[model samples]
Target: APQQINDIVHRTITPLIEQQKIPGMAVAVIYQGKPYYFTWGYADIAKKQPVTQQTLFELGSVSKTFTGVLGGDAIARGEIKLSDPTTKYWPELTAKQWNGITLLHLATYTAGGLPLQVPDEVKSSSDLLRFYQNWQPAWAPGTQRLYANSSIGLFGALAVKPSGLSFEQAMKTRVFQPLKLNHTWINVPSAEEKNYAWGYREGKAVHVSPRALDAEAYGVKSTIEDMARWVQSNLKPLDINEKTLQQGIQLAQSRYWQTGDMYQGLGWEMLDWPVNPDIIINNKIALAARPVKPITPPTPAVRASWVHKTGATGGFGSYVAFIPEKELGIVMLANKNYPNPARVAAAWQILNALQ
Candidate 1:
């Protein structure tokens, strides 16, 4: 398996590294409940370090899936509900202005067209709340799907509000620790900083810079090993020591909305199986806002489906995809921020071979 997988990975990755100037890449695959890893290039060219199973890469918005699970678990424990209005947690939002806004809208990136990011001027949570308080909706919540970082970040905050814990604290307690994800975090601990990869941008090494709502939105950093464990859990739900979290994970992947063949889960996106590998997009209108039809009762697929998410920071890029029916999953993380199509193509090639 190693030799065959190695040939496929190198064949797919080497060209992208050469063409995109990518500093390093780590690939992890789960096949029939077994894990395989492959690496290429240097994590830091000057330091002469290579990407290893221990190398931690920033996950960007891929962190939202974890945020999704947190929100789902919160519901499982009766801490929150989809029908609950934002006003229930933040009264200043006012039921009048934020009408139709619910935990479901926030978790699924359908919070009445929140932008991809919070305004640059909004520096703190207080500022963020005010921004929301004064914001105007472009569409009625649940009528349109508009992806946004601020929306998910706000959802994370409210998800943990009942427990009186910070978003990171709640995630650590509920998701990371119980799932046994030892090295995943919004902020990697200093002791383990040695394993963190340096993201490359413009021929120079850089790490993710801080941003407002960064932790809740795009702030997770993890190794392929830890990510594979997270993916494995999704494929088969942990064997034991879990019901609430497992149920939450299942909830996160449940289909809540749809547009054509695309379905929206809390964080995961479901596409009809045998999907076009090049189906992702970077166009502003496409990523920002699109009409969607609601799936009453929000059901999972009755047949095979592709469940996945793509994430990127200024200096890093990542893609994760898994097919539950086939019991196969792939994780691709790179130090250099590259095009989404390249990542998708590389994964598509390997996934095709596995099939």
Candidate 2:
């Protein structure tokens, strides 16, 4: 039985905004290769400007998936290997007690133990390196999933080092340009400033600030139009005809580890879709972990699933999730920092009724 997807989206999202005082939001869904869009509130509430498909939102940690894609692309090109130790590229890390951490460990959020956010002292790459120099693991690598921005920030360096380009350059050359993502940017260029949505926090307009070390971890800024295209790219990688791009998307979604019942890929969360969304939105163990710590799950049954990622900054929030087999996906970008459970719940309702 086909459901009214528009009805479902409206039903699910309308109340969220009504309840939360969200300033503005843009949500899009991909079904059978076509995108359906919805916008609510205002892109600039004070200006009374409504959100549009082209309005840009700070993607926050959802940016990490792009980093994951870049790293995965490098791996696909034989420029790097995930199994290789980070110490191989940054010899400065060799003296660290956690010297055994591999690029794979960092990409999968299992790099022993990195906190959810970069330490305040690590304000730059050199500072991050210095922090790593004296760092020791709280748990053995591969044994736990400790979500940390530093891991991917370090991974950005590892992935881009072999290419003789900066992380931004590598992303542009390898992923964005090829994918035709003109609206996406690591740093939203000055000319595009008008298109960038002003994020809101506690009813006050707030802007995302630049951080050198965490750029790769949470710096992407993009519009719903661009993100919808990104979702489409993930859903139909084979259509692109670029080997590296195809492989990168595949690798980004491939299950690399399990944290309790949740599965993890490079920078995406893998989940068995069509199951209760509560499994993700309400998982106490994972919710409590903040950045989330990975744990090995009980072996046994197999099932079809999808890949997802969530992001938030001081004022913005975003979510991207897709089921490749069904070629279905959703992208949500909002000016207000909406809760993850709200994002997941909306996505789940739409996905469940997509057919």
Candidate 3:
């Protein structure tokens, strides 16, 4: 890794680690096919266990990346198709509004009617179908983007179900085993419970919060070593026999769904990405970038292009990015519930510095 990249990462995040009182962090960076790792602070500040590459930390929603990879892989294998409606896989989803929504929309968070978190009303899979059946869309499918866990989480389970496998089995068969990542466990077995790290509310040291093991939302335990392996995998693919690598690579390539300046691909958030006019703005510029439409658009033409995704829940915060143009990527995980955009400021700043 470049010295500048290392400097950028520590310089950007170290302050937050201090200010927020986050006890421990595991960071991995890959540049030009090599990996760099830094483990800082204490995994358990009370016991004073030093954070290390081998320490397990919750991966949060970054699990969506795995989910998306498998979903696309299922498509690639002809087990399913992205354009297929949810009804094709789960025939019980009796929702008229969802009739036209594709698995593609669900994986990309472009299902307009979806909620950020599954409502308390959803107690089980049947409840999920009922919620969608009566739900109203604020924007039509693929027209506007809203971040919704229900869309992707359900999509993940849906994909795995029709594949004649359990979700954990599919992920292991397709992704985890191929990368040779030793420290990753989707449904961490009881045998390995000892390594689970406790999380703080705001930072490294705060009131402890209960850990979440939601496979679709905030499940999966991994160490910095495994994350570094993931970083290395994106740098270059490993021989995971599942054949999902090509599908995941394709899904990560460019904009699969368009918002204002942001284009969401399967499991990835893309910014400053040059979009085809026909697919998006209907403009004719040579490199018309994706637009940023927050609830309101802020600035325009500020294209610090990035392909990123983040995951967080009570005890874990994680972020990962791969700059296709630059052939660089970074992954960071912490054992705490630091908020989004804010907690990841340092990691993003490092990417900015590198660019």
lDDT of each: 0.84, 0.80, 0.66
| Residue lDDT tens for model 2, 35-62 | 8888998999889988998898999989
Q: Kindly list the per-residue Cα lDDT of model 1 for residues 1-355, writing each as its tens digit.
A: 5676777877887887898888888889888877898888877889899899989999998999999888988998999998899889988788575987998898888877887787878887688778887778888888888888888888888878997898889999999999889999898889999998898888777988787888888989999999999889877764536789988888888899887668888878877778765564332322747788888898954337778888999889999988888888899999988988778777778877876
The stretch of ten residues in a row with the least summed lDDT in candidate 2 is: 294-303
For lDDT, candidate 2 versus 3, the one ahead is: 2
lDDT of 2 at 28: 88
> What is the Cα-based TM-score of model 2?
0.93
How many Å off is the CA of 334 in candidate 1?
Answer: 0.4
Ranking by TM-score: 1, 2, 3
For 1-355, candidate 3 gives per-residue lDDT tens digits of: 4688667776877887887667788888776656788878877878988887777887777777777767767767778777788788877775677768888778767677576677754666667667767677877676655667777877887777777888888888777776787679876677766666677664444322332215755567788778767755654433334456665645544356555455666565666734322322232211222232322221221223465667776666778876655656788888776756464456656655665
Q: Native-vs-model 1 lDDT?
A: 0.84
- Which scores better on lDDT, 1 or 2? 1
Name the regions of candidate 3 deviating beyond 4 angstroms.
1-6, 202-213, 237-242, 273-305
